[PDB]
Amino acid sequence: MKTIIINGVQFNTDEDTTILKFARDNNIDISALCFLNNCNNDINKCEICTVEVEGTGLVTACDTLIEDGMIINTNSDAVNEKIKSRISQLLDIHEFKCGPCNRRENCEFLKLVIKYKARASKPFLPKDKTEYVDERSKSLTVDRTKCLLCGRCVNACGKNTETYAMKFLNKNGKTIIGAEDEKCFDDTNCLLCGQCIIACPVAALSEKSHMDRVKNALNAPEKHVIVAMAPSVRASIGELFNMGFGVDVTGKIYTALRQLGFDKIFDINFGADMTIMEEATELVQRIENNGPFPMFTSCCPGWVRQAENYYPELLNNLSSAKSPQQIFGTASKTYYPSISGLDPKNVFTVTVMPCTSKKFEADRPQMEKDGLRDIDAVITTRELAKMIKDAKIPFAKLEDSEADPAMGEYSGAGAIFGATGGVMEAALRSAKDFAENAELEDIEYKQVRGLNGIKEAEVEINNNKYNVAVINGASNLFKFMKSGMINEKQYHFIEVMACHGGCVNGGGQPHVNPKDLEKVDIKKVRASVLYNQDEHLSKRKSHENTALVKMYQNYFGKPGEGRAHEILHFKYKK
Amino acid sequence: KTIIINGVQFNTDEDTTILKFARDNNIDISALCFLNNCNNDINKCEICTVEVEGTGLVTACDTLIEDGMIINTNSDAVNEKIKSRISQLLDIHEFKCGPCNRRENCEFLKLVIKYKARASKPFLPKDKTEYVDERSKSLTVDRTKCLLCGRCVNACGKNTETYAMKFLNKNGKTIIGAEDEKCFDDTNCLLCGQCIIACPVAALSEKSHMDRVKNALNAPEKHVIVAMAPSVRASIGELFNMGFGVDVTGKIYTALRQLGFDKIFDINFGADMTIMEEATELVQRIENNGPFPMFTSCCPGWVRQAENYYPELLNNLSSAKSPQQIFGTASKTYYPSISGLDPKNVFTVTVMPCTSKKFEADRPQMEKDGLRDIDAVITTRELAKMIKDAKIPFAKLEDSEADPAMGEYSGAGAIFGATGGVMEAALRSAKDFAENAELEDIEYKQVRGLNGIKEAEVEINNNKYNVAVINGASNLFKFMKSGMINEKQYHFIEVMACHGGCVNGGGQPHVNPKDLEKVDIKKVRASVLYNQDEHLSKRKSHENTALVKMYQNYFGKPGEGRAHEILHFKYK
Ligand code: 402
Ligand code: 402
Ligand code: SF4
Ligand code: SF4
Ligand code: SF4
Ligand code: SF4
Ligand code: SF4
Ligand code: SF4
Ligand code: SF4
Ligand code: SF4
Ligand code: FES
Ligand code: FES
Ligand SMILES: [Cl-]
Ligand SMILES: [Cl-]
Ligand SMILES: [Cl-]
Ligand SMILES: [Cl-]
Ligand SMILES: [Cl-]
Ligand SMILES: [Mg+2]
Ligand SMILES: [Mg+2]
Ligand SMILES: [Mg+2]
Ligand SMILES: [Mg+2]
Ligand SMILES: [Mg+2]
């Protein structure tokens, strides 16, 4: 056992952990900045977690293991002058203009500048932000006027994707973060998943803004602006209006969108039901043809990029169904004019996504038909929150409203798409019914749910056994393939999602303080909203969605063939 | 949350698994495929099964606790599930412990004994040859022992990121091995043996050199020299039930004499030699303004990593031979010059905590004048076996001393086995060399310890130089792929393939994952080495009296002449 003294309090412990973790567990404040999720910035450490170890001097608490005999002081004058000095040095390279800053309301650096009363030796007033800003990407934007060189984005990229697409670079003798060879991220092995953004304590990493695309369409007299939100938005955007965690705010979002001036309020969960219609049909077709197996889902554009960049040979095994976003968009330019009278050229389709890679998907050159984009703009959860606040809409006070049903109705199977294993469970509900020409009552597939990085189950379909896997995060895709787990049996259907936890933890989602993250499992609490909706919805299979059935009967015909295959599918390989 | 566990109620808000909550509460839940916070995601072993009243049978190693959970870890239903799974594993296990090299500390056997599980049908292959792969210079596989638990695959991925160890489908059967069933030496494998350390059975082993050694000892004309690595003296006592962190240096020396070795030397003497050459090289690069960075080259797992993944760095590797090979070279040249042995009859054996060292010793060009630097390498485990087989009462032995001519060592050589050891040792000599001084302050604590990537600014002749210590092969990938390498000009970088350094090498004693929850094995083994440094009168390699005499009388000046001629090795 070890005896540790911290601020004169004696602890007898058998734990092997860092000073920072031990002190936090015991309600002793130690500041931190570059430390996140059990890693700090190993070169040029920030030292904001400085403490004193008697006999040693100043040490960094976030990466020093406790040892028998240590006498630690966390709040001496010398400690506090060190930390204040380090923050002051960061202010010397930080454009400290929080008024217009997109992290004004939840910035970790501002909280430290306030706590320690730090101020720059010289205000940093960059004059050519075109040089510090890289907006070339369709998904990510770097603003190096805000960058603290804390390396949290680099660490998060490594842990979440193992691509190390985000790197430290030497640019004319100064350190920056960016992509390989300072390329546009899109032109590298980057997945555009935005997990680097989620890790960033400041406004240095952001989504690529589509707010001007949206505002300009709303204000254009002849544009009819459709909006539809992803499953995950209704389980998370309330966090940015101080409503707490795990609050279902679906009805408030519909009201806020109308108050923002959107012309039609639909829902991507309707598109999720469309994707299941096509993809469950495709899975039954492959079961009948004995393959090709495995079929992989194709609805996560981070995974599609990962396949393109690292496993191009699996592209022919991807489902050809468009993603909920893109399948919805396709219908919004074809079916929706047919039931509304809008000129298709004047429809402008906007999605609200928990995701940055969806902006890349929407802007893919072939994601259009007859000159009309499937999807004209994608705004993240964060961007929609900013629009609401800029409009002075009192979100938390709003009354609930409903979506326009024609492409707004959704089943419980669509509702759970945002959680890891949601696509899988939703697709099995329909595929089992299709294959057995039955209306089965047992529809919960709890074995594919939850936060294990690689999940598997054996399922019975029409008196045969099939193996499915759910791959929960891009790093786990690499693990699953490189370890040869894929070889241990014949897999028939595999869901892959780039973001651990599923879209509820996507790159466009609200930032959460790491000290709210202590007490809240954000992945499970956001996902719980979606499973709750499923549990209370009357229709829990995508093919029971009434508005969807009407659309197929009146416009698309039979899923998985013909017209539906013609325009609702996408050749990912070619 | 209040959770009952076998009747006992528990109050908690830890957000942890059943397994780890119980392990913390000293409640016994068995596990097999769970190690390093990962289980075998595909085909999980289910040995950690427990009963949550309400849900059913669940795997404790990857299921999170919840309020009011009532949990039975020992119900009749739990126990016949667990026994069924063990029995099914025995059905694919050649259960013949008598000659097995894990007989005394097999983790799987401890489980079998705990449940008194047996096969339903004993697995008794008449012809094992198709199950065994002994082609590698370092690693061997015996699939008649393999549980398909995935621990080696997870350990390779986490420790090295090479994923050279994989699940494969072979004739419709699942096996572990390398892609296309290649010899591991021909793959990107580092031969670090972290997979062996992770394996709970004898399926993965070191390539035995025990026959080389015994045949040399028994050959009348061979004069067998033996020398042990830093880490062996801090580890081998574990295999004699002496506990952790025990310095058994002097007992090892006595045991080696009782085994019949003809001369007892020490690789720490070779470590001091490596520092003489390498610190000299570092000072010469400083004077020459490069090339920088200089990388250490004394870890053959890192050398293979550089060869396979960073060939552009090979020109930056230090040309000093590793302590093993530099000692070997001297044992064939210097040692005959002070003894009268015919060089061709000298047979040099090292004892290493490491499997990659066998590959290093067998490298074609690791020889001079026809004489191998090193003729055999036995692991810590192999030496323990040899001692036990010879009926030597290790723990009862009185201390003896090494033969001093190549057996003396300084505290700088003593710390090599720990991550940051070479760095600290080398700086102690480089600063003295560069400043033409005898400096008093020699402790470089900032490069020590278990952080995966460590750095320090050091001042030599009033100039500042940047150093880094890369602690584990996966951290080398991180350092390079993250661009950390380009944040500043590094001048000297230590790289070690095994996290913790050689004290955590692939030839070391296996440790029960239960002992490993109570003991920081990396720190406790390293502590022995730093303790020796603390208590040695000479703490700089260039103060080693035997070494100084050998340079004065035989090799001349480090970095020049005969020393450059035979004590260096260039990778190209
Ligand atoms: N398109 C689509 Fe998806 C749907 O439906 C989203 O909108 Fe996802 C979410 N939430 C996102 O971003 S994408 C990947 N599949 C799971 S959910
Ligand atoms: N040769 C050499 Fe080394 C020395 O001295 C050993 O013997 Fe190591 C140990 N212990 C091993 O194996 S190698 C890697 N450098 C650090 S220590
Ligand atoms: S990143 Fe934070 S401190 Fe900097 S300008 Fe924005 S809100 Fe202010
Ligand atoms: S978007 Fe994802 S893959 Fe690209 S740098 Fe960020 S974390 Fe890495
Ligand atoms: S972009 Fe953000 S996370 Fe990355 S180094 Fe800069 S401040 Fe840190
Ligand atoms: S998991 Fe969801 S949020 Fe993350 S990249 Fe894929 S689609 Fe986007
Ligand atoms: S691996 Fe373990 S159980 Fe199997 S034969 Fe060897 S000692 Fe016995
Ligand atoms: S020896 Fe090391 S690199 Fe090779 S398979 Fe084993 S763990 Fe992986
Ligand atoms: S070799 Fe060992 S660790 Fe690897 S799967 Fe077989 S029993 Fe498990
Ligand atoms: S760190 Fe030591 S034990 Fe591990 S491979 Fe390198 S030399 Fe061998
Ligand atoms: S928080 Fe510890 S060094 Fe940055
Ligand atoms: S130890 Fe839990 S499934 Fe193997
Ligand atoms: Cl395209
Ligand atoms: Cl409508
Ligand atoms: Cl060679
Ligand atoms: Cl001697
Ligand atoms: Cl440490
Ligand atoms: Mg660190
Ligand atoms: Mg308008
Ligand atoms: Mg697991
Ligand atoms: Mg003999
Ligand atoms: Mg190669």
mmCIF file of N, CA and C in Angstrom, chain B residues 176-228:
data_model
loop_
_atom_site.group_PDB
_atom_site.id
_atom_site.type_symbol
_atom_site.label_atom_id
_atom_site.label_comp_id
_atom_site.label_asym_id
_atom_site.label_seq_id
_atom_site.Cartn_x
_atom_site.Cartn_y
_atom_site.Cartn_z
ATOM 1 N N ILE B 176 -4.616 -19.289 -34.862
ATOM 2 C CA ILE B 176 -3.877 -18.033 -34.830
ATOM 3 C C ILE B 176 -2.538 -18.246 -35.526
ATOM 4 N N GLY B 177 -2.040 -17.165 -36.103
ATOM 5 C CA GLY B 177 -0.767 -17.190 -36.795
ATOM 6 C C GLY B 177 -0.544 -15.898 -37.555
ATOM 7 N N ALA B 178 0.420 -15.934 -38.457
ATOM 8 C CA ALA B 178 0.664 -14.788 -39.331
ATOM 9 C C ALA B 178 -0.076 -14.934 -40.659
ATOM 10 N N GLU B 179 -0.245 -13.804 -41.352
ATOM 11 C CA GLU B 179 -0.937 -13.822 -42.634
ATOM 12 C C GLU B 179 -0.274 -14.851 -43.536
ATOM 13 N N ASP B 180 -1.109 -15.657 -44.176
ATOM 14 C CA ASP B 180 -0.692 -16.704 -45.109
ATOM 15 C C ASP B 180 0.165 -17.755 -44.421
ATOM 16 N N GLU B 181 0.070 -17.806 -43.098
ATOM 17 C CA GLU B 181 0.759 -18.829 -42.311
ATOM 18 C C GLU B 181 2.266 -18.742 -42.525
ATOM 19 N N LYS B 182 2.755 -17.524 -42.767
ATOM 20 C CA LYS B 182 4.179 -17.335 -42.957
ATOM 21 C C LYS B 182 4.948 -17.526 -41.650
ATOM 22 N N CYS B 183 6.246 -17.794 -41.792
ATOM 23 C CA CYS B 183 7.144 -17.683 -40.643
ATOM 24 C C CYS B 183 7.131 -16.262 -40.087
ATOM 25 N N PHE B 184 7.018 -16.105 -38.762
ATOM 26 C CA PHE B 184 6.880 -14.754 -38.222
ATOM 27 C C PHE B 184 8.056 -13.865 -38.577
ATOM 28 N N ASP B 185 9.241 -14.446 -38.740
ATOM 29 C CA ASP B 185 10.411 -13.633 -39.043
ATOM 30 C C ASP B 185 10.286 -12.944 -40.386
ATOM 31 N N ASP B 186 9.478 -13.497 -41.287
ATOM 32 C CA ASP B 186 9.313 -12.967 -42.632
ATOM 33 C C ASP B 186 8.176 -11.960 -42.729
ATOM 34 N N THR B 187 7.531 -11.633 -41.625
ATOM 35 C CA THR B 187 6.424 -10.703 -41.560
ATOM 36 C C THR B 187 6.884 -9.393 -40.910
ATOM 37 N N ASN B 188 5.936 -8.496 -40.646
ATOM 38 C CA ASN B 188 6.244 -7.252 -39.954
ATOM 39 C C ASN B 188 6.422 -7.425 -38.445
ATOM 40 N N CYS B 189 6.213 -8.638 -37.948
ATOM 41 C CA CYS B 189 6.427 -8.983 -36.548
ATOM 42 C C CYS B 189 7.754 -8.444 -36.050
ATOM 43 N N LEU B 190 7.739 -7.879 -34.831
ATOM 44 C CA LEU B 190 8.926 -7.371 -34.169
ATOM 45 C C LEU B 190 9.658 -8.430 -33.376
ATOM 46 N N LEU B 191 9.046 -9.619 -33.229
ATOM 47 C CA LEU B 191 9.557 -10.738 -32.422
ATOM 48 C C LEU B 191 9.724 -10.361 -30.950
ATOM 49 N N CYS B 192 8.909 -9.443 -30.475
ATOM 50 C CA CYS B 192 8.981 -8.914 -29.114
ATOM 51 C C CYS B 192 8.408 -9.849 -28.066
ATOM 52 N N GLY B 193 7.625 -10.812 -28.487
ATOM 53 C CA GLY B 193 7.022 -11.793 -27.614
ATOM 54 C C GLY B 193 5.990 -11.310 -26.631
ATOM 55 N N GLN B 194 5.385 -10.139 -26.871
ATOM 56 C CA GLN B 194 4.294 -9.698 -26.002
ATOM 57 C C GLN B 194 3.094 -10.616 -26.122
ATOM 58 N N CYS B 195 2.944 -11.250 -27.279
ATOM 59 C CA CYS B 195 1.925 -12.264 -27.465
ATOM 60 C C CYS B 195 2.140 -13.446 -26.522
ATOM 61 N N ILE B 196 3.398 -13.892 -26.368
ATOM 62 C CA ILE B 196 3.718 -14.968 -25.435
ATOM 63 C C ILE B 196 3.320 -14.585 -24.020
ATOM 64 N N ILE B 197 3.694 -13.378 -23.618
ATOM 65 C CA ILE B 197 3.404 -12.909 -22.267
ATOM 66 C C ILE B 197 1.896 -12.901 -22.022
ATOM 67 N N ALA B 198 1.095 -12.572 -23.056
ATOM 68 C CA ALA B 198 -0.356 -12.539 -22.923
ATOM 69 C C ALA B 198 -1.012 -13.912 -22.929
ATOM 70 N N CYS B 199 -0.313 -14.947 -23.354
ATOM 71 C CA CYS B 199 -0.935 -16.250 -23.580
ATOM 72 C C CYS B 199 -1.059 -17.004 -22.261
ATOM 73 N N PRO B 200 -2.234 -17.566 -21.964
ATOM 74 C CA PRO B 200 -2.469 -18.241 -20.684
ATOM 75 C C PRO B 200 -2.033 -19.695 -20.668
ATOM 76 N N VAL B 201 -1.519 -20.210 -21.787
ATOM 77 C CA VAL B 201 -1.162 -21.613 -21.966
ATOM 78 C C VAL B 201 0.176 -21.668 -22.695
ATOM 79 N N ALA B 202 0.609 -22.871 -23.067
ATOM 80 C CA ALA B 202 1.882 -23.060 -23.746
ATOM 81 C C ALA B 202 1.733 -23.015 -25.255
ATOM 82 N N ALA B 203 0.703 -22.339 -25.767
ATOM 83 C CA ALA B 203 0.546 -22.329 -27.207
ATOM 84 C C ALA B 203 1.606 -21.474 -27.873
ATOM 85 N N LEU B 204 1.982 -20.366 -27.255
ATOM 86 C CA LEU B 204 3.055 -19.533 -27.761
ATOM 87 C C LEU B 204 4.234 -19.637 -26.818
ATOM 88 N N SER B 205 5.427 -19.813 -27.384
ATOM 89 C CA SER B 205 6.638 -19.974 -26.596
ATOM 90 C C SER B 205 7.797 -19.280 -27.284
ATOM 91 N N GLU B 206 8.881 -19.133 -26.530
ATOM 92 C CA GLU B 206 10.136 -18.740 -27.142
ATOM 93 C C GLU B 206 10.725 -19.909 -27.936
ATOM 94 N N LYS B 207 11.462 -19.589 -29.009
ATOM 95 C CA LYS B 207 12.249 -20.611 -29.699
ATOM 96 C C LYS B 207 13.372 -21.068 -28.778
ATOM 97 N N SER B 208 13.372 -22.346 -28.407
ATOM 98 C CA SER B 208 14.294 -22.845 -27.405
ATOM 99 C C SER B 208 15.726 -22.821 -27.926
ATOM 100 N N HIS B 209 16.641 -22.301 -27.092
ATOM 101 C CA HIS B 209 18.076 -22.471 -27.313
ATOM 102 C C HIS B 209 18.672 -23.419 -26.276
ATOM 103 N N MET B 210 17.827 -24.160 -25.564
ATOM 104 C CA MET B 210 18.331 -24.907 -24.381
ATOM 105 C C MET B 210 19.218 -26.052 -24.861
ATOM 106 N N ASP B 211 18.908 -26.647 -26.021
ATOM 107 C CA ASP B 211 19.787 -27.652 -26.606
ATOM 108 C C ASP B 211 21.141 -27.080 -27.048
ATOM 109 N N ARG B 212 21.169 -25.902 -27.671
ATOM 110 C CA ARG B 212 22.458 -25.277 -27.972
ATOM 111 C C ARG B 212 23.311 -25.194 -26.728
ATOM 112 N N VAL B 213 22.712 -24.700 -25.644
ATOM 113 C CA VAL B 213 23.486 -24.447 -24.432
ATOM 114 C C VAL B 213 23.946 -25.750 -23.825
ATOM 115 N N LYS B 214 23.032 -26.722 -23.708
ATOM 116 C CA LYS B 214 23.424 -27.985 -23.081
ATOM 117 C C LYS B 214 24.484 -28.711 -23.899
ATOM 118 N N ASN B 215 24.358 -28.675 -25.235
ATOM 119 C CA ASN B 215 25.349 -29.333 -26.085
ATOM 120 C C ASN B 215 26.715 -28.661 -25.966
ATOM 121 N N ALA B 216 26.732 -27.326 -25.822
ATOM 122 C CA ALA B 216 28.007 -26.631 -25.621
ATOM 123 C C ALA B 216 28.591 -26.965 -24.249
ATOM 124 N N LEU B 217 27.760 -26.943 -23.206
ATOM 125 C CA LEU B 217 28.270 -27.294 -21.878
ATOM 126 C C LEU B 217 28.855 -28.697 -21.874
ATOM 127 N N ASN B 218 28.242 -29.613 -22.598
ATOM 128 C CA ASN B 218 28.690 -30.994 -22.573
ATOM 129 C C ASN B 218 29.804 -31.296 -23.559
ATOM 130 N N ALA B 219 30.078 -30.410 -24.514
ATOM 131 C CA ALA B 219 31.176 -30.599 -25.435
ATOM 132 C C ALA B 219 32.481 -30.356 -24.694
ATOM 133 N N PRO B 220 33.392 -31.325 -24.643
ATOM 134 C CA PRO B 220 34.588 -31.121 -23.826
ATOM 135 C C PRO B 220 35.409 -29.928 -24.240
ATOM 136 N N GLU B 221 35.482 -29.608 -25.524
ATOM 137 C CA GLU B 221 36.392 -28.583 -25.982
ATOM 138 C C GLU B 221 35.802 -27.175 -25.929
ATOM 139 N N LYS B 222 34.507 -27.031 -25.656
ATOM 140 C CA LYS B 222 33.905 -25.704 -25.621
ATOM 141 C C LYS B 222 34.062 -25.066 -24.258
ATOM 142 N N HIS B 223 34.451 -23.787 -24.268
ATOM 143 C CA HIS B 223 34.578 -22.950 -23.079
ATOM 144 C C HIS B 223 33.373 -22.021 -23.118
ATOM 145 N N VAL B 224 32.374 -22.324 -22.278
ATOM 146 C CA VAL B 224 31.077 -21.650 -22.360
ATOM 147 C C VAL B 224 31.049 -20.463 -21.408
ATOM 148 N N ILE B 225 30.997 -19.264 -21.973
ATOM 149 C CA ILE B 225 30.824 -18.030 -21.236
ATOM 150 C C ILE B 225 29.329 -17.778 -21.095
ATOM 151 N N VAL B 226 28.899 -17.261 -19.940
ATOM 152 C CA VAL B 226 27.520 -16.828 -19.789
ATOM 153 C C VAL B 226 27.444 -15.412 -19.240
ATOM 154 N N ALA B 227 26.446 -14.652 -19.710
ATOM 155 C CA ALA B 227 26.275 -13.298 -19.221
ATOM 156 C C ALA B 227 24.791 -12.963 -19.267
ATOM 157 N N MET B 228 24.268 -12.379 -18.181
ATOM 158 C CA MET B 228 22.841 -12.075 -18.107
ATOM 159 C C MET B 228 22.557 -10.590 -18.312
#
